Amino acid sequence: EEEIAALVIDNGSGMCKAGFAGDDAPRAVFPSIVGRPRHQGVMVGMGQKDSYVGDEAQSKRGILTLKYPIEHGIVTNWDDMEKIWHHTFYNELRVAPEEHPVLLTEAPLNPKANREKMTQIMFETFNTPAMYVAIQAVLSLYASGRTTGIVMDSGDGVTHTVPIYEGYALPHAILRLDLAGRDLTDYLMKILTERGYSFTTTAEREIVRDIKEKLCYVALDFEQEMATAASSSSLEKSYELPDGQVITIGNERFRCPEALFQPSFLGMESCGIHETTFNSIMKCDVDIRKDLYANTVLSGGTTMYPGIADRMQKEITALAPSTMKIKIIAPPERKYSVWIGGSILASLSTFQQMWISKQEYDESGPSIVHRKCF
Amino acid sequence: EEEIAALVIDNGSGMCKAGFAGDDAPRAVFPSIVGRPRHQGVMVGMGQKDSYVGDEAQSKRGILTLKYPIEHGIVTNWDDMEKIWHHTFYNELRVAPEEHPVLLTEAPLNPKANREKMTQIMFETFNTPAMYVAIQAVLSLYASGRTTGIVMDSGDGVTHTVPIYEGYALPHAILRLDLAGRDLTDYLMKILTERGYSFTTTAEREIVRDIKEKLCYVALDFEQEMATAASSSSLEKSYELPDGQVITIGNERFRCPEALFQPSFLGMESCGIHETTFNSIMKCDVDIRKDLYANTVLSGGTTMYPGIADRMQKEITALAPSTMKIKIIAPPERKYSVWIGGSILASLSTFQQMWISKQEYDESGPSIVHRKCF
Amino acid sequence: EEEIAALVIDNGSGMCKAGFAGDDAPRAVFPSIVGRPRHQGVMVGMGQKDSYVGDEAQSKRGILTLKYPIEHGIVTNWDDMEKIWHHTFYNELRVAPEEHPVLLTEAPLNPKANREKMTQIMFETFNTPAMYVAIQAVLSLYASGRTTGIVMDSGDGVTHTVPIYEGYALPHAILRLDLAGRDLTDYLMKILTERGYSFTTTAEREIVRDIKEKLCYVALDFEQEMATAASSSSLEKSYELPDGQVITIGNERFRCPEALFQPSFLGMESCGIHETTFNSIMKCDVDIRKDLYANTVLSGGTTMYPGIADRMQKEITALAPSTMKIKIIAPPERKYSVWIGGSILASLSTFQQMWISKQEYDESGPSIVHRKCF
Ligand SMILES: Nc1ncnc2c1ncn2[C@@H]1O[C@H](COP(=O)(O)OP(=O)(O)O)[C@@H](O)[C@H]1O
Ligand SMILES: Nc1ncnc2c1ncn2[C@@H]1O[C@H](COP(=O)(O)OP(=O)(O)O)[C@@H](O)[C@H]1O
Ligand SMILES: Nc1ncnc2c1ncn2[C@@H]1O[C@H](COP(=O)(O)OP(=O)(O)O)[C@@H](O)[C@H]1O
Ligand SMILES: [Mg+2]
């Protein structure tokens, strides 16, 4: 075949988004979880299967304890990650990685060890001709088809912010904020408890993740919505648990995402996301700011909440000079923006020379990741 | 021969159900009773036979006092148990236990001593190559051919409840309730006495056991049926005693099994069986409950009463979320479910390595029962 | 009189600890139990007394079914709670609550409804000039006379963990773990059953509570002590039941409290208490940790077991940086720490303005609990 295709994998914590480069959507997207049988089984002709990976784990949740191998964009446990990748290639895609160059995503400002060790695995686990490790934000910017913008990247892992102008990139200006979907989830299960509902275990932690993925939304003004919580009508929603129990969540709903804008709720000093965006833009040269204000791109799973764009717009506009208009461009399909970006990058002809080649690695070692790529 | 066959014995109190592993029904099933001649005989060329075991005792009831060696899943008297096993092997099956591995059932949450001492006997009474001691509920779940369910196991011994999901098993969730066929019998002979019929002795205690095994049934609503007892037509039934006396039992019929649902009748606080099932399910992880509500399996002799399934369905449905449908799967042939399960387990190839070997016992002692098996 | 005194009540589940503020020990401490006559009485000139409350119930146990009105720091049944309070004021203290401000304790992360409804009662049941509802852990910290520490609060209700620095308090860092004395009791009665002793009913459930309150102790290494259970000498203890029966409990003794450190025994994923302490401390700012490691305060009834402090010390030290010394301060008289703390708080002059006044409640409603107090 010509070009051999190429493989693309986005692993921020939470989800693996994988598929062939050269396609508009990934084939396989499943949770990055390694569940292990915590309870000793007593039958015969079970499994045994030491552990389960991917949406298999979601299916068989109750038995397993689930461990997310990636936290804050850092891989805690490598064998687990390897297992997840194994599952992606063999269980879903059904590819021999020897037959494809593979692109990995990775978060900014992230420890060297992850990049280096990541590459070490790809070469000395799944024998592969070539690979590349790329910054998440840039990829989403490509996916949006814009050359310039400040990409607000918040996955389940961590939140990141990379201003870009006319390609280029500003290292000093790049900002990385420790908040995530996962931290919102931890907050949310906390806030439920004041209602009586107690979710103590990893299994049901994912149930609240599911709740947040739909029920929660961001206030266009927090205090107003909280005021109107007095007369509860629309702000309460019934949710059905798999157990059959019913949950009813009022104001607690929208204050969950509020945390992004008020990390004091979580107890961290680190400024809210909008202020971090200012922190990034303000670090940039005076000249370019005009378009960064106007070209803010949101990406990642934890920007999905309804109404986030609007709130960011209102806050940024409030803070900034009203001399210039602040457009925020947040597409739907943002969740997959990183992966799409990866697809487009591996599809690019010129890119086909920038790969880290197996050969190059074998001569020069794992450390070469930083040398060559950003 | 290949595989040597294998032997299976279910001893919850009341009945020994024994036969070859690898068959759909046991060969021998007889009451676990050791009758002793209480009255001194005066002839010559009698017996003497110090005692009788098995349905022999049933045949010659009047003379004997019967002693059930097992109470509440605990063996009161070991020599008696040994005698019963003796009878099973030599009198019915006609096997040398040296030539067969033997599987025993045993109830959950049961004293260690019973398992340990059980094994001690099997090795140092009937010399046997290998043996295993297995939980009653699991076996019935196998017999039902389902991988998941909450098995309500009530024999004559005691009642037990073990939720199982996808194999696995939840120790904390396992529930054991002190009610049984035998307690119903004791209640029943009490309740007859208000009608005039007085059954004071072990002999006729078994007569009432027999009555209960047919005449009694469970109300689909207790109070309604008791109300309709005013106009007695169908609720009375004539029963014939072996004496030739006739008994006529009305409302007293169905309130006997009612006890399972209202142990206040018996004077115990311990919740009714349906509530115990909820106690089990509620102990389990939120995720799996959906299928446990739907997969409740009834086993054991004292689930045989007509209408039990329906009542359990109505009560559980009433208590639970009506968001999810509560199927109860109670097969006919449930009585033998444990033994069938044993047959299927010993038939399994892989199981053939999990046996407790004679050798292993000889090195490691009797205590190894818990170490190896559940 | 000057200052009017003030009243203090600690209701975690299990025990009501009440007395006058301004004294070093409470006057009345009795079990929070509402026993009801389950068996219909037949004499004349009984009672009748629909139910019994407090150590009255302990005295007349056999007849009654006992219901603990508080579970997991949540009041299940309000009328019952009201009855208990009734008993405290009128039966023991002999006070008119109109003549005293009353302080109530309450657990962290606890449902709003409990605080709100609690206040609703205090104003509109026992007419009272003022009241306050206060977090359990803080009170114990006061009682210990330290300004800073991480208070490990485990009562019979639930276990809680609140780090405090120089006063202040860290909401995100506060942890609440569902284990308790009551869960240990449930575990314990389970574990006895393997020895033959079967305790099926609420009455004798309290007998095992009593056993645990003395016989049980925590291993300084679990596996070592369990190993030494082979040669049983000191690890067995005779206990006398009220029935006159004698119980003899070996290794089963110390594995009961082991559960706090290995909740897998109970079947919960939720980490052990020491790990929860780390979970709390790790959530806190890097700066303060040094003193939190050194200032851990244990409170509540279910820290009473001999050897808990030592085990916590060994585990925390093992997990933490050995760069800094980990003192754990666990006073004897810890059981009453919450109540003492309450005494000291109501004794404080400045506190006398922070009360929730009857007047304020009447204008503003019950919801004001959260508005004013923590
Ligand atoms: N539909 C949704 N609405 C709101 N939040 C969502 C939704 N889907 C996912 N999330 C949140 O975003 C997270 C997924 O982020 P993801 O894009 O997988 O990050 P990454 O690409 O870095 O792995 C989830 O864990 C969840 O908290
Ligand atoms: N046909 C029947 N109808 C109703 N109840 C029955 C019937 N047969 C047996 N029982 C009750 O169930 C008991 C038998 O239980 P069994 O299955 O032998 O328990 P286990 O398997 O634990 O020994 C009897 O003692 C009797 O009380
Ligand atoms: N002397 C003791 N030794 C060991 N455990 C005890 C002792 N006394 C009480 N306990 C355990 O602690 C519980 C009492 O906790 P308590 O302090 O009343 O909690 P709270 O203050 O939240 O009500 C009892 O139910 C028992 O399990
Ligand atoms: Mg991402």
Ligand SMILES: [Mg+2]
């Ligand atoms: Mg049985």
Ligand SMILES: [Mg+2]
């Ligand atoms: Mg307490």
